Amino acid sequence: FDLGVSSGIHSLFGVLVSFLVVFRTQAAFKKWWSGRSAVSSLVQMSRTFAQQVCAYVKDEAYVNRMVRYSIATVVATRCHLRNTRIDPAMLLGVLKEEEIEELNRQKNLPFYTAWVIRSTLAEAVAEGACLPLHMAIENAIKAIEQSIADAERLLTPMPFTYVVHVRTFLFIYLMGLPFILVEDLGWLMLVAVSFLGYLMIGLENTAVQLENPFGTDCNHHPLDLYCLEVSQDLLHLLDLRASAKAQ
Amino acid sequence: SDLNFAQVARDEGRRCLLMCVAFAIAIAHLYIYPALFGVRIVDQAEVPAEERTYFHHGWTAMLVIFFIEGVTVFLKVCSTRKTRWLEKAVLQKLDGNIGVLIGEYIVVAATYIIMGANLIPVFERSGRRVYAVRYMEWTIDACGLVYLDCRILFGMPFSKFRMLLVYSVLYMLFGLWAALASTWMWYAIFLSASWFFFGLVCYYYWTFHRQNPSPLQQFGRAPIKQAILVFVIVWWVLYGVLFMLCFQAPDVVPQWLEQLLWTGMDVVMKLSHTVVLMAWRETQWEIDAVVDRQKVEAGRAIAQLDHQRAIHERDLVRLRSRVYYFARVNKIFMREAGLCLVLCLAFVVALLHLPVYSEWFGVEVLDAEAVPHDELGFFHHGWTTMLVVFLIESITVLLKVWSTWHDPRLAENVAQQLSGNLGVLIAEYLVVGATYVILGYNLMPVFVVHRPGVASRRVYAVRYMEWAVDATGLIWLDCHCLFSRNFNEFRMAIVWTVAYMLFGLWSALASTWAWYWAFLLASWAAFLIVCLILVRFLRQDPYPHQPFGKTSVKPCILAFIIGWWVLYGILFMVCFQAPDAVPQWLEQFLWTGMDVVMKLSHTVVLMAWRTTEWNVCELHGRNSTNWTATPGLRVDLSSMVRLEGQLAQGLVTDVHRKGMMRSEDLAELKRLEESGFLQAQQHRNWESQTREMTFLAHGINHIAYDPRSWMKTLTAVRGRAPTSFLLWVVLIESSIVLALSKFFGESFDLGVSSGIHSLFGVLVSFLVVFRTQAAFKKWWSGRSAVSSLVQMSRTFAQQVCAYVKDEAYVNRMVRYSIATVVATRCHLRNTRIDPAMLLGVLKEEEIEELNRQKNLPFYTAWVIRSTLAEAVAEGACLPLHMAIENAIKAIEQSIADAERLLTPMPFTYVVHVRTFLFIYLMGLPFILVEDLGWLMLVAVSFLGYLMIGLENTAVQLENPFGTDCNHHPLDLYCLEVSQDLLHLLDLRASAKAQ
């Protein structure tokens, strides 16, 4: 055989590809975390908006409109990241039907819900139904959309070049390992190459998974529970207000 | 039509498996019974050896057709798996014949193989040696044949099949029992019953003919379905005659004639059968008409969609922007007729001019019967196989024409199909056959070589000439029919291929390696440049989707071809360098097998290509998760198709569309494209179509990819990083070091050292990966900036349209916000604005006043602010104005970040890195060559590529804003924004009118 193993072709490639493959993973964990943060911030802003409205406003027909369409905004963004439309079953006791059919007739939903909210708040301010605390409300609305936009950034894939390079040289290293390992072993060379290949390739695919946090896979974020939480809280808030108003 | 894909494959499998099990068990049971039971004397298994060669020949010549079909149908099914209805069509065209044909070929080949193994000479009159398995495989073959014939011609699944099948098997087994025993002993008992059952099945055939005597709709005035039945039955008659005459007459020699007749007969019979079948199959049926009818409707519906959107847009833009604000046939034959003669004459010229220049001025001129025993047995195979293929193609064409003889209009179609391609195949086949015939029994000299080291290397003459000529054919074909090109661009490849083949020959003649390497290197060079030209031809293909229907079969073809070709060269090397490696007979066997396989594959691919719509004109012809970067941009079908039209094929992709389109519209389009490609042009124009075109034409160039796929990342070429002049320097250095270490022998004294190597390695590695992790971050920051800018613009517009009551200020503001975005996309690239991007949003004079400035976003913001002040003074604005001002402030921050991202990293940090990398690389060989040779070279090449590509990749990612394909797609964001705001104006207007 005359293997003539060489340290340069083996050790150097090893250290390089190892650096690369672990860095490409530490870079995806961060995106995962940033998505978590975005979601939490969105939820919190929604709740503050609802409280502000139900306290610093005195009418009752504007309040419903606003709160319910905020809920709709959340449910809409959970369906803008997955390129779908809405299932009425998720908006049963919060909206009337015609409103839902008018929603699904649009192209960008959160846009629409925010436009609605804003026109409604303007109506309110004109009729002196709102205390001087309105700028806070506007600012809350502004801060929701930032969260949305971050969540939307998180859908881009890493650039082509940086991935092609990594993958091809990994493939090379693996296809070259045996010719240098078989000199001193037999079947052990085989089992070792199997295990090592699994390690590396699994690292890469794990990074792929973590890259986009929003999806159906089991390691992704549970969007469907946050919506439920929000619905519960706001619909209880309406009743708190109503009771405290009747006395 | 309710078929599927799984059911058909399941049926094919089960049928062929029943065939195989029956065929094997019959022979096994006969073997078991004939030894101990009955009067069955078993001749010696060994003798003779001279008869097994014939059966081997038959074996090959049979395997060929299997391969042909098993490849063609695979091509078809894999080339149109993306369209339901073409799948329906093909799966209909092969209801149940495939499994049975495959089983037939498998069993016959297995039996003619077993003949070599010499399992049992059960032969027991005198002599007239016979073999048993022939009878079992004949049972199976005839039974499958009759099932096929009845099913196709009459459609009787279970009624006639059973009786005729049992008859066949019964009288075949009777004939077996009969011939196994002596003639006088047991002829009457069985052979008479055999003849009688033959007559019975003949009567059944005649009755079923009288029942349904209709011609095959595939054919026309052809006598088909009658000529073939007559031929088959008279052939069975001749077979029975031979059976009766073999044992009776001693005059007919049973040693060789006997052994040959059955092989010939079985082969020719099965071949006529399968060729008639393929001919009946390749004809166009009504299903194609159904599909074309489905297809045209799609273009119609598309034009309807376009008109509807046109009317809608017209009304909308009016509302918002108005109120509140026989010759051809004979020539198609004659061209091919001419080409064939050119090829023949060239081959004759070669064969005539070769030996007068060799062995008259050449050493080792004579080899007397180079090796009589081994070689001829290898060569007698090739010309036989090629003869087979020849006959197949010829009769197929003859049948096609015979079926399209009466109808003139149909004849011109096929005539045009066969143009430019048929002339090459016959020439290739016949020349290969003739050359390998010459080699079989040598009329031509053999030259040996004498050189230092070893001299037993044998060499053959003609093999090379044909190769060259041969190759050219392929070239002139594989670069013309596949990639539609004229002749002016083929010249170089032809001029260079013969060249490097001649150089390979001249080299091979002289293994002295004093001047051997010259022609070898020149040949490698010409071959390489040919490959480069070829891959360029491919990558500049105008019609890459046609005809194989949007698949990756063509590049794979090219890859297979090139790998084959370089395998030839590495074998050449392995042989002539180390003759101890090669036993020199295996070498000729391999050469022959490869020459066969290449042409087999080439012809099957051209066969499958001939029968596609692009040739046969109907409706057209020859004249989970969301990966994306634009989650807010959604497009409409009309624009997608208008775009795919206004561009060249192969620039848009599946994922390009999956990212810039909704899900429902995409599913609808997919359903609508089941029939074909859907290329069409409505030729409708508007004010918005221009804008959308101007943006998309620029935006598409950037790449979109699915990370989950591993192929399109490795095999990818386009988005890769460029390299520098350094690699060449390093290869130069290494090559001289190697040649010089060998010439200088051992006195190198490398004295490798761990400090100079390992330390430098770790340091430079750290540095180079850090310099890349530092650029990825800038890329990401730019993405963030862009998103924030877009979001702020939209919030500003909403705030304005809600918290303001006038209508002339609103327009001004919104439109100039759009202008601000389009301006910053042109401040990062140091250009000015193209009016086509601001058509329906601004008046001309405003644009000319813009382009007259130096810093544009400055100007737009100034405008906006003065306008908002005007508004506030006149009490036209609610108390919510500070929010508006703050939004304006927040836009500019985003802009400034994007502008930071144009600075380059500092000089010092880059100079240091680069120079020490260069050093490390230039030093590697002197320490590596001690333990290796050429391997040192290849390793340094690869490692250099890794490192230098890393650096250049970092360079690319450093500035994210540019034209390169890995950069950010600014032109789509602008489009998105325009759409949203111009819809917002209309929302407001409507809600104001009620």
Ligand SMILES: *C/C=C(C)/C=C/C=C(C)/C=C/C1=C(C)CCCC1(C)C
């Ligand atoms: C039908 C057979 C064909 C087209 C075979 C062609 C053979 C070649 C293109 C091989 C060329 C070689 C080189 C790459 C250089 C060294 C010598 C050869 C012949 C092996």
